[PDB]
Amino acid sequence: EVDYNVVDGVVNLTGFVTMVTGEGLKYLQNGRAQFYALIVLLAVLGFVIFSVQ
Amino acid sequence: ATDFNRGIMKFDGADSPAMIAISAVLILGFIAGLIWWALHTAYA
Amino acid sequence: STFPWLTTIILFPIVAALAIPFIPDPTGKGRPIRWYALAVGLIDFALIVYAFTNFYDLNTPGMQLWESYDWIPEIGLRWSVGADGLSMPLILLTGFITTLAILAAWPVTLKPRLFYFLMLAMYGGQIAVFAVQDMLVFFLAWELELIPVYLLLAIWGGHKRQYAATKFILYTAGSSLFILVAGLAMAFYGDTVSFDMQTLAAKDYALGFQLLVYAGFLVAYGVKLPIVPLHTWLPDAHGEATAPVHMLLAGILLKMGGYALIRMNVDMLPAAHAKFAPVLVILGVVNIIYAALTSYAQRNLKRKIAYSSISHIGFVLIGIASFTNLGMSGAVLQMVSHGLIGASLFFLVGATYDRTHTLILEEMGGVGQKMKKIFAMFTACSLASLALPGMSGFVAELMVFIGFATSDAYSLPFRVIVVFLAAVGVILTPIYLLSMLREIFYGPENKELVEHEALVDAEPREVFIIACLLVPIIGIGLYPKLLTQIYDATTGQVIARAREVLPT
Amino acid sequence: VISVKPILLAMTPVFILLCLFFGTRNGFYDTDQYHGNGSAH
Amino acid sequence: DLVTLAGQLNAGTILPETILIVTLLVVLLADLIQGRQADRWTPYFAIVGLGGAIATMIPLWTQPATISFFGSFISDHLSLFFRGLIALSALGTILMSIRYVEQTGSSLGEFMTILLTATVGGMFIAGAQELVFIFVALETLSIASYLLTGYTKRDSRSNEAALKYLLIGAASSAIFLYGSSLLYGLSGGHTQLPAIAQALSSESLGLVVALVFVIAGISFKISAVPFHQWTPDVYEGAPTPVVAFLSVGSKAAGFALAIRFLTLAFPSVTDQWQLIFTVLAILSMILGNVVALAQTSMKRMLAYSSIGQAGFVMIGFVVGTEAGYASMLFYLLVYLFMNLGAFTCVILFSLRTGTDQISEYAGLYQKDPLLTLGLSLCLLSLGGIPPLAGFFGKIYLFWAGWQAGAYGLVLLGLLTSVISIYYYIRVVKMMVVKEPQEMSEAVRNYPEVSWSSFGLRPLQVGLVMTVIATSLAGILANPLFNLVNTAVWDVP
Ligand SMILES: CCCCCCCCCCCCCCCC(=O)OC[C@H](CO[C@@H]1O[C@H](CS(=O)(=O)O)[C@@H](O)[C@H](O)[C@H]1O)OC(=O)CCCCCCCCCCCCCCC
Ligand SMILES: CCCCCCCCCCCCCCCC(=O)OC[C@H](CO[C@@H]1O[C@H](CS(=O)(=O)O)[C@@H](O)[C@H](O)[C@H]1O)OC(=O)CCCCCCCCCCCCCCC
Ligand SMILES: CCCCCCCCCCCCCCCC(=O)OC[C@H](COP(=O)(O)OC[C@@H](O)CO)OC(=O)CCCCCCCCCCCCCCC
Ligand SMILES: CCCCCCCCCCCCCCCC(=O)OC[C@H](COP(=O)(O)OC[C@@H](O)CO)OC(=O)CCCCCCCCCCCCCCC
Ligand SMILES: CCCCCCCCCCCCCCCC(=O)OC[C@H](COP(=O)(O)OC[C@@H](O)CO)OC(=O)CCCCCCCCCCCCCCC
Ligand SMILES: CCCCCCCCCCCCCCCC(=O)OC[C@H](COP(=O)(O)OC[C@@H](O)CO)OC(=O)CCCCCCCCCCCCCCC
Ligand SMILES: CCCCCCCCCCCCCCCC(=O)OC[C@H](COP(=O)(O)OC[C@@H](O)CO)OC(=O)CCCCCCCCCCCCCCC
Ligand SMILES: CC1=C(/C=C/C(C)=C/C=C/C(C)=C/C=C/C=C(C)/C=C/C=C(C)/C=C/C2=C(C)CCCC2(C)C)C(C)(C)CCC1
Ligand SMILES: CC1=C(C/C=C(\C)CCC[C@H](C)CCC[C@H](C)CCCC(C)C)C(=O)c2ccccc2C1=O
């Protein structure tokens, strides 16, 4: 029972958090067109913010 | 779960978490203690 | 001596596998395909035997057949092959096991073309792993066996094989993740950027850098070779399979991870090997203990034998870190004996699976009242597997115990504790193999097992494969001096270098 | 001391010869005797 | 004409582009005069013209590096290699588009005119020393990719994606044009990049602002992590040969523009954008190979795989050694054939069946073995199987990354490749593993196992040539490494 539960659940837990990370990161693509350009302008501003500081 | 207790290995506590948790932490504690004791005992 | 032999032996199944999609019209099940593949494997084993019996000498402790070929003027991919002392019986075991696995694969109907093509593709890689003497081409040959066995276990297996096949290919990718890093780390230290194997052993590194390199080696070699934190892949891999792929699964594929575990982690760096030697010995002890205690409570027929692979590779994990000439020489014999036992046992399990469809130990009560050759072969293979001295398993564990008894720097507590724990490990390891033979055959005649399925007594062809697999184990266990002289000088040089590096 | 090459070169040709002779021997996979394609599934 | 003005003009390193322009004019005149009934010799004539344009670069290879049009165009082995790469992309796009355009319903010559215009723009942007020339060629490629999106004629997905792509491309072009005007204003007034980079060693903040504003419009064309918001919507609604051209030709054009512009403009502030490129590659490989595990559409899976594999090329651009750009030049050459085969198999499966969902892929082992064989042999090369050339590219990439001193980038690349092999093997798992009485509908009635209707034989022999090339480039790549390494030492 220890070999079937404890040492076996870790690989399934890593696969499950990888799957829900992929799900939560593909949920970002909503479909709004100008929100993409807003993200682009935020990245353009944040690049200068990170490079100056 | 269902296909693990069908012969002469049938008991009452098999899938309960409160027993397998303390059994697993006891097994891992003795494994870590044996590894630490063999590391601090050998080459001395 | 001026002719390339190992290169043509590797390249001949890869060339001959192109005739498998050609196949002029058989008008049947695919019998010319297996009749051609058996002849190809037979002439390949004949070429292997003819190359072994003539040019391989037992005097030079280095490499007899040395052939180097400049592939590219780039990075350092160089086709440099070389046969060593402790690697020369491995190729003869590989060819014999693959030839008998090709001969044992008669009832193949659903897609035999891709089956025999992947068989001839894996037979090239199983020699290209052991015959290469590079750092990058070795990783290439290690990743060469990624796709075909995973594809075979995907296209056929037991139930819910899709969950096991993806886990197996992701485990093999996680194994191959660290090999390129650990190969480039030792090569990028200082100068001599070329990837020659003889120059990497003469390099000098720092203490912490050697500890990090040995950790990166041991993580991949603990993922590959099954130890108690990294053996969850092996029941799903070796329980859900058919017999002719399980022969190569339980034979040379498990010894591939143990041969490199010796050759890299002893010859390349022995300074960090002594600091992890008690950890490796204790891990092998815990492996030997845990495999029997896990397999005794299991009800599946194939995982009960798949954990015996862990129980038998724990002896190799003990005998690797013994720092003794006899303990190092017994590990190769233990690997050969374990491969020759496990291939026969899993072929026998896959043969008796077709006669009784249910894989449960409870309903199997009266299968011994009709067929007797099957019960006799199972009893003979089990008694060869447990502790018998006529077979070489007892001789191998005796060599391990004698080499570990006369050791150094483990004087008062460690030898007696590890010996007392391996003694209760060999107490525990025949229990499940005795209980399986007691529960399956020994009992009354079940009426429903005969009413549902009808079993037929075995062929004389099935006697021939077990008769060919059982006689080398008896030949080694009766006279163990046949395998000693093959790698005695190599093991002596290895132990001499390991004792020269180790102080006090 | 016993060598491996003269005891292997005298045992391998009969091993090559017996493979085809036992490959033509069958009888269990011939009439029907089984309901399946050969694999486990 | 005068011999002195023709010698000072140096119009000898422009001949394949003029051959392609003459071919475009002859194709347009044949479409105007004859019409729709002459759709059997025009793409073969365009293939002959592309071959004649790619074959005359061999006298241009053994020539000294001279400038042309008064310091406007520079002709090297790198520009010739990029032009040959773009021509090999365009010829495969024609071979995959010959049946697809006439199955769509539009005229082929009106599409081939814009395709040859984009090919000429890519061949002009493979050099592109001058700043106004960079802007003109980049907007030519941008207008080409605008007009090639809305080709489906009122089908809703392409015209709904084309407006979003037009918005994002116009924003990125305005940002890049503002950065280009800023870079023109930071210098004394010069437009040539050796004349600009001489007087830019002062370390001003406006130089960093102009570098970010130029690299934003550059990384829009490379489609790295902060500007990847257009491609998962673009790649699904656009037609498949259009996106097959845009996945390789525009990407190689953006890579060549980035390499040449950053080399000829900023040999002083390299460590400022090296950390930015490490951040971009680290985010891009992770985001691609984590997002692409959950998608259920095959075209969107290849779209996110493009973003996941575009980050591996940035590891060769992070480093400053001479063996770093050779890894990118080899990986783009392998990725051209890999994406060509992976697009040809999807085009065949979508033209013979219709829709191309993942779960519909079951039952391909019995109907057509050649199509699933080519798709498996191409996706295994895309995954990194060591008999194939993608592993031979990735080993050289990781070797350059571990030699120059980038340990974490190679470690994250290996981790993302190990993660990505699970969804790289999923299409093969749907194809060659699924048993009978398990496949979905519209597979059991495959009527056209033989190809004899309206030029399916060039589409078949292109996939055969792609499979043979990606099978022979893995074990035999000895002149390819020399041809890559002989065009990398010229970059300072
Ligand atoms: C210590 C060194 C370790 C080295 C190895 C790790 C190197 C890094 C590996 C990279 C991580 C991979 C992430 C992606 C995983 C994923 O996609 O899973 C998707 C699949 C699908 O799941 C299954 O899929 C089935 C459907 S199907 O098969 O996919 O079709 C479905 O039926 C089922 O429900 C579902 O479970 O999951 C699995 O098959 C489980 C295996 C996942 C392998 C992850 C390896 C990580 C191991 C961590 C180390 C363990 C240490 C143990 C000791 C403490
Ligand atoms: C170096 C050490 C080597 C150790 C080797 C260990 C081998 C252990 C084998 C154990 C087999 C157990 C089977 C028990 C009997 C059974 O049920 O099957 C009975 C069937 C007979 O079939 C059938 O038997 C029926 C009789 S009955 O059913 O048993 O009543 C009969 O009716 C029918 O006609 C017939 O078809 O099997 C046979 O008896 C075949 C002979 C097997 C016995 C092996 C003899 C051991 C010789 C040792 C040689 C040493 C080699 C030294 C090398 C240098
Ligand atoms: C070096 C090799 C390493 C292993 C890599 C191989 C990966 C496995 C191949 C992919 C699956 C292909 C299925 C295709 C489907 C196909 O086209 O054939 C389908 C064909 C159908 O035959 P069957 O009789 O099985 O048909 C099904 C019938 O039974 C009806 O039920 O099967 C074969 O003949 C297999 C032939 C091998 C085909 C694979 C050849 C690959 C050649 C290249 C190998 C690599 C060379 C590398 C450079 C040296
Ligand atoms: C209680 C304990 C009892 C233990 C007794 C066990 C003894 C075992 C020892 C074996 C080592 C033998 C070495 C001697 C051998 C030896 O010294 O002579 C070796 C000798 C070689 O001859 P020459 O040296 O003249 O040859 C020179 C040429 O070979 C050069 O090419 O001849 C052999 O090759 C014999 C042929 C092999 C014969 C194999 C016999 C076994 C065959 C079994 C076949 C299977 C039977 C299956 C039945 C189903
Ligand atoms: C409506 C159709 C429009 C189709 C395009 C028209 C093509 C007509 C002229 C061919 C251009 C190539 C001439 C090279 C062919 C060639 O090598 O000729 C030879 C000579 C160049 O010779 P070099 O001085 O390089 O000498 C090479 C020798 O030294 C080696 O033996 O070219 C001329 O005489 C230049 C004057 C041509 C007239 C001006 C043409 C240049 C402007 C054309 C527009 C250029 C931009 C076009 C792309 C946008
Ligand atoms: C580095 C690698 C480069 C490789 C590139 C490949 C180069 C070679 C490719 C040739 C294959 C193409 C022809 C095969 C096609 C073929 O064999 O099939 C014949 C082809 C198809 O005809 P159908 O059979 O459809 O004919 C109508 C039927 O319905 C009646 O049977 O018809 C042609 O004649 C097309 C016209 C080709 C015209 C060729 C060009 C004319 C000369 C142009 C001179 C150009 C000067 C330069 C431009 C200014
Ligand atoms: C010229 C410089 C550039 C050359 C580059 C080469 C490009 C590749 C070759 C394409 C030329 C055109 C072939 C069209 C083919 C053509 O048009 O059809 C020729 C013919 C098919 O048509 P048939 O003449 O049978 O059809 C008559 C009809 O009327 C019946 O419906 O042969 C085929 O079965 C071809 C099979 C594909 C075979 C592809 C092989 C390609 C060569 C591969 C060499 C491999 C070496 C492997 C070494 C291991
Ligand atoms: C190939 C190989 C090898 C080999 C070698 C050798 C050395 C051989 C042989 C040897 C020898 C020199 C042996 C022989 C002898 C013995 C014998 C001859 C035995 C007997 C047995 C029998 C015959 C029986 C049978 C049976 C039984 C017992 C019962 C049940 C049933 C059966 C059938 C199982 C090696 C190792 C390298 C490893 C690798 C592989
Ligand atoms: C037009 C036509 C042809 C003519 C087409 C032939 C000439 C084949 C044309 C193939 C071209 C020449 C392949 C070009 C090869 C490229 C050099 C490949 C490079 C690109 C790779 C990277 C893919 C036929 O042979 C035919 C046969 C049977 C039925 C119908 C037809 C048919 O309609």
Side-chain angles (χ1 to χ4, degrees):
Chain A
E1 286 290 329
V2 160
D3 191 271
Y4 197 66
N5 286 316
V6 179
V7 295
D8 192 61
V10 189
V11 194
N12 302 330
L13 171 144
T14 52
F16 190 75
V17 303
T18 314
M19 279 300 298
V20 307
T21 298
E23 284 278 320
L25 281 179
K26 71 102 175 180
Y27 287 163
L28 200 65
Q29 212 78 21
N30 43 2
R32 302 276 196 268
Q34 289 96 351
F35 180 53
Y36 297 154
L38 181 63
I39 286 180
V40 161
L41 290 153
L42 283 169
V44 163
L45 188 65
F47 283 156
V48 195
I49 282 300
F50 185 71
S51 160
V52 161
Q53 176 184 2
Chain B
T2 308
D3 46 17
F4 271 67
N5 42 3
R6 40 196 172 186
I8 55 186
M9 316 294 296
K10 182 199 301 179
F11 302 105
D12 56 347
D15 312 288
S16 315
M19 184 69 173
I20 67 179
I22 57 176
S23 87
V25 73
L26 261 173
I27 285 301
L28 264 299
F30 194 95
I31 280 177
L34 190 65
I35 285 177
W36 179 85
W37 167 77
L39 196 55
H40 274 257
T41 303
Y43 293 95
Chain C
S1 198
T2 184
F3 188 73
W5 290 106
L6 302 181
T7 306
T8 55
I9 288 169
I10 286 161
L11 284 178
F12 191 75
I14 309 296
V15 167
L18 296 179
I20 313 296
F22 285 161
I23 51 167
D25 196 353
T27 77
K29 317 294 288 179
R31 303 172 178 173
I33 316 173
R34 56 196 198 182
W35 266 111
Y36 172 71
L38 188 52
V40 158
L42 271 182
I43 66 170
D44 202 272
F45 188 74
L47 195 57
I48 282 175
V49 163
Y50 190 77
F52 163 70
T53 185
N54 288 323
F55 305 98
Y56 185 72
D57 210 1
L58 298 176
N59 273 16
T60 317
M63 306 176 185
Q64 322 299 317
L65 276 82
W66 177 252
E67 165 195 351
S68 171
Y69 263 79
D70 206 307
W71 208 352
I72 46 186
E74 274 303 310
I75 318 163
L77 293 168
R78 182 178 291 172
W79 195 253
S80 45
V81 288
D84 215 328
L86 54 96
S87 159
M88 206 49 218
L90 282 182
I91 317 177
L92 275 74
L93 192 58
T94 290
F96 188 73
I97 281 299
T98 308
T99 298
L100 277 186
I102 282 176
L103 190 146
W106 296 113
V108 49
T109 299
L110 183 60
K111 311 168 185 178
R113 290 157 213 207
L114 197 69
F115 164 67
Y116 280 112
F117 171 69
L118 263 60
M119 180 75 61
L120 291 179
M122 202 201 305
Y123 183 43
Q126 281 153 343
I127 315 176
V129 163
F130 294 143
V132 71
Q133 211 65 37
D134 213 325
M135 212 61 174
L136 212 45
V137 196
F138 181 72
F139 174 57
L140 190 146
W142 197 278
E143 269 207 12
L144 174 55
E145 57 98 25
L146 166 70
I147 188 66
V149 53
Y150 152 76
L151 274 186
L152 292 173
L153 271 71
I155 65 183
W156 43 67
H159 299 99
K160 57 201 170 302
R161 61 217 184 270
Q162 195 52 60
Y163 170 70
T166 52
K167 183 184 290 186
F168 167 67
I169 188 180
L170 284 177
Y171 257 91
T172 304
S175 162
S176 291
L177 187 136
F178 298 98
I179 310 179
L180 174 61
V181 166
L184 284 180
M186 277 199 304
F188 278 149
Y189 199 77
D191 299 81
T192 51
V193 201
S194 171
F195 297 146
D196 302 68
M197 197 84 90
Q198 294 299 309
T199 45
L200 284 172
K203 294 188 181 186
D204 213 358
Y205 323 101
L207 189 58
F209 179 69
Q210 269 183 358
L211 280 178
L212 281 178
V213 165
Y214 201 87
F217 274 151
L218 204 60
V219 158
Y221 287 150
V223 162
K224 180 63 178 182
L225 213 70
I227 328 176
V228 305
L230 296 159
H231 73 293
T232 43
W233 73 292
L234 209 62
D236 314 328
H238 282 218
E240 298 189 8
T242 185
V245 69
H246 211 302
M247 288 183 60
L248 317 174
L249 270 173
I252 44 165
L253 200 55
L254 291 176
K255 328 292 164 302
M256 172 182 304
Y259 158 73
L261 175 58
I262 300 177
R263 193 181 194 88
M264 297 303 181
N265 283 344
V266 186
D267 297 5
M268 279 300 166
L269 65 162
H273 171 263
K275 293 184 172 182
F276 283 85
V279 189
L280 206 62
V281 159
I282 284 299
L283 272 181
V285 166
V286 168
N287 224 28
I288 280 185
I289 293 289
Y290 208 81
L293 284 182
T294 301
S295 161
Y296 171 66
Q298 278 187 324
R299 280 304 166 187
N300 208 23
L301 189 51
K302 299 191 181 179
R303 308 169 187 176
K304 207 174 193 179
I305 318 293
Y307 269 105
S308 309
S309 306
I310 292 176
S311 165
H312 279 235
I313 204 68
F315 267 111
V316 194
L317 211 54
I318 285 179
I320 274 169
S322 165
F323 269 110
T324 323
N325 211 332
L326 193 57
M328 193 69 65
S329 87
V332 179
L333 197 144
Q334 172 59 54
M335 281 193 302
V336 165
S337 159
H338 171 42
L340 280 172
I341 281 166
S344 87
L345 208 45
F346 274 116
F347 161 68
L348 272 184
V349 160
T352 198
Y353 172 72
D354 313 318
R355 311 188 190 273
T356 310
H357 277 263
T358 188
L359 214 62
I360 316 293
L361 306 177
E362 271 71 28
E363 284 97 316
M364 286 173 156
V367 303
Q369 298 279 346
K370 306 298 180 179
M371 41 177 185
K372 264 79 61 179
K373 303 180 182 179
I374 290 296
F375 167 67
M377 282 310 198
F378 288 177
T379 303
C381 273
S382 199
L383 286 169
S385 165
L386 311 161
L388 255 59
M391 279 62 73
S392 77
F394 171 72
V395 192
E397 68 183 1
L398 172 81
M399 279 182 177
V400 163
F401 278 144
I402 289 305
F404 185 75
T406 79
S407 199
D408 54 23
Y410 307 117
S411 165
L412 287 70
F414 193 75
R415 296 194 287 253
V416 301
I417 288 298
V418 168
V419 155
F420 184 72
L421 283 176
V424 78
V426 79
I427 288 191
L428 284 180
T429 199
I431 301 290
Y432 55 92
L433 291 174
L434 274 184
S435 87
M436 170 188 54
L437 265 298
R438 194 205 65 86
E439 282 265 339
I440 290 184
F441 285 88
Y442 283 94
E445 186 178 29
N446 217 338
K447 313 294 292 299
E448 42 187 63
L449 204 63
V450 182
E451 171 82 353
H452 276 282
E453 292 289 328
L455 53 97
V456 166
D457 198 0
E459 313 176 77
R461 188 253 313 166
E462 304 197 32
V463 192
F464 173 70
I465 311 178
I466 316 294
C468 281
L469 286 170
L470 210 60
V471 292
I473 316 166
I474 313 177
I476 293 159
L478 277 178
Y479 211 72
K481 224 173 187 177
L482 302 177
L483 289 185
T484 297
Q485 68 177 23
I486 307 181
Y487 45 80
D488 193 28
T490 310
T491 43
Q493 188 202 281
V494 158
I495 294 312
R497 286 188 71 250
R499 288 176 94 95
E500 182 186 310
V501 171
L502 181 74
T504 317
Chain D
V1 285
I2 307 299
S3 315
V4 195
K5 311 173 186 178
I7 209 175
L8 191 59
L9 269 186
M11 213 163 68
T12 192
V14 306
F15 164 68
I16 292 172
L17 259 54
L18 278 178
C19 285
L20 313 178
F21 185 72
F22 275 95
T24 72
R25 291 302 178 180
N26 269 323
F28 174 61
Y29 297 108
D30 272 18
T31 319
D32 48 77
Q33 296 271 68
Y34 191 29
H35 40 278
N37 47 2
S39 81
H41 274 312
Chain E
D1 198 8
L2 279 76
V3 56
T4 299
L5 309 189
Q8 288 274 354
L9 191 62
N10 210 336
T13 59
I14 211 167
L15 287 165
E17 294 165 348
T18 75
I19 290 168
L20 286 185
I21 280 177
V22 163
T23 299
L24 189 149
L25 261 295
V26 170
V27 160
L28 196 56
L29 281 179
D31 208 0
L32 275 174
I33 290 300
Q34 299 194 248
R36 215 181 72 181
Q37 58 86 13
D39 212 1
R40 44 193 73 252
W41 67 275
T42 312
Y44 293 148
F45 165 70
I47 283 168
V48 160
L50 263 171
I54 210 170
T56 180
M57 301 179 180
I58 318 292
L60 282 175
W61 193 271
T62 76
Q63 276 298 120
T66 60
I67 52 178
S68 50
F69 304 100
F70 292 91
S72 198
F73 183 74
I74 173 172
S75 57
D76 296 320
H77 326 291
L78 183 75
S79 303
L80 287 171
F81 181 72
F82 269 112
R83 279 177 275 188
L85 191 71
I86 287 171
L88 282 176
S89 158
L91 195 148
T93 312
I94 290 165
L95 281 179
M96 292 177 315
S97 155
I98 274 166
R99 202 54 188 96
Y100 204 93
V101 164
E102 270 293 351
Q103 202 63 36
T104 293
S106 316
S107 44
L108 187 40
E110 293 174 329
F111 169 71
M112 292 277 275
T113 300
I114 318 176
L115 187 144
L116 285 179
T117 315
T119 299
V120 169
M123 284 202 171
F124 269 121
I125 212 169
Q129 172 196 5
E130 215 166 8
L131 180 143
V132 55
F133 189 75
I134 280 169
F135 175 68
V136 164
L138 193 64
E139 212 77 21
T140 306
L141 191 69
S142 282
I143 289 289
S145 165
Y146 289 154
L147 292 168
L148 284 193
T149 314
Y151 201 64
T152 49
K153 274 310 286 152
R154 94 185 62 93
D155 189 27
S156 44
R157 295 181 291 268
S158 79
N159 52 71
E160 269 156 10
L163 196 48
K164 311 179 180 180
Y165 182 69
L166 174 73
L167 258 60
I168 294 175
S172 279
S173 200
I175 285 176
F176 174 71
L177 189 51
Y178 190 77
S180 177
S181 88
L182 212 55
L183 191 146
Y184 168 68
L186 286 168
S187 180
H190 312 112
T191 49
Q192 303 177 5
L193 303 179
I196 288 170
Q198 277 183 353
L200 282 188
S201 78
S202 315
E203 188 64 17
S204 312
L205 190 146
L207 192 59
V208 189
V209 167
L211 190 133
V212 172
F213 265 81
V214 161
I215 211 168
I218 285 183
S219 181
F220 163 69
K221 269 297 182 180
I222 313 184
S223 76
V225 71
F227 319 113
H228 77 299
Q229 304 279 348
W230 55 275
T231 169
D233 300 8
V234 161
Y235 277 36
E236 183 188 9
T240 322
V242 164
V243 75
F245 167 68
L246 285 176
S247 167
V248 296
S250 88
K251 191 176 296 305
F255 270 122
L257 187 145
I259 286 175
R260 189 143 293 268
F261 192 79
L262 276 157
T263 298
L264 278 179
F266 306 102
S268 60
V269 285
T270 65
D271 50 24
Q272 282 209 353
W273 48 261
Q274 273 178 353
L275 54 95
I276 301 177
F277 266 114
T278 57
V279 164
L280 289 183
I282 278 176
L283 205 58
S284 182
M285 294 182 299
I286 284 183
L287 193 55
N289 295 5
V290 166
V291 158
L293 299 165
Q295 295 299 323
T296 175
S297 195
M298 180 66 183
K299 207 165 299 176
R300 204 168 172 98
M301 192 213 69
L302 198 143
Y304 278 124
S305 159
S306 158
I307 321 172
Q309 281 183 348
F312 287 91
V313 195
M314 299 294 208
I315 321 176
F317 196 71
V318 156
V319 310
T321 43
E322 294 293 327
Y325 308 99
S327 174
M328 312 165 57
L329 286 178
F330 192 72
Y331 199 73
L332 284 179
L333 182 59
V334 173
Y335 181 69
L336 168 74
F337 288 92
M338 289 194 305
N339 220 1
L340 268 173
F343 263 116
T344 315
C345 274
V346 166
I347 277 168
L348 272 178
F349 192 77
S350 159
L351 215 65
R352 288 297 181 88
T353 302
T355 190
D356 46 330
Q357 296 184 354
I358 287 181
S359 87
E360 202 184 5
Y361 266 113
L364 215 49
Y365 199 78
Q366 305 172 181
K367 306 302 175 179
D368 198 351
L370 182 60
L371 173 64
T372 176
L373 169 67
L375 190 41
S376 315
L377 214 48
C378 276
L379 218 55
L380 282 192
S381 161
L382 205 67
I385 301 310
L388 296 164
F391 184 78
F392 272 80
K394 284 185 180 185
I395 288 299
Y396 183 45
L397 196 142
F398 294 150
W399 176 83
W402 216 265
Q403 189 193 21
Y407 313 102
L409 282 168
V410 172
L411 279 171
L412 199 64
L414 274 164
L415 184 60
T416 47
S417 177
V418 160
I419 287 176
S420 86
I421 207 61
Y422 165 69
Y423 88 97
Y424 277 149
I425 206 66
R426 197 161 62 184
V427 195
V428 188
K429 184 252 290 180
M430 209 69 60
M431 274 190 300
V432 310
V433 190
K434 295 304 177 182
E435 59 191 330
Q437 43 83 51
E438 216 279 310
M439 48 184 172
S440 198
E441 302 287 79
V443 195
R444 308 173 182 266
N445 52 3
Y446 202 78
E448 200 154 60
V449 293
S450 87
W451 47 98
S452 87
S453 66
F454 204 66
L456 283 169
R457 194 154 310 273
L459 186 49
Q460 188 256 340
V461 75
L463 183 60
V464 165
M465 185 68 74
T466 316
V467 159
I468 290 185
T470 195
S471 288
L472 288 198
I475 56 176
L476 295 178
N478 214 334
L480 292 180
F481 276 121
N482 284 347
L483 190 146
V484 160
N485 286 322
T486 195
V488 70
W489 62 275
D490 58 329
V491 175

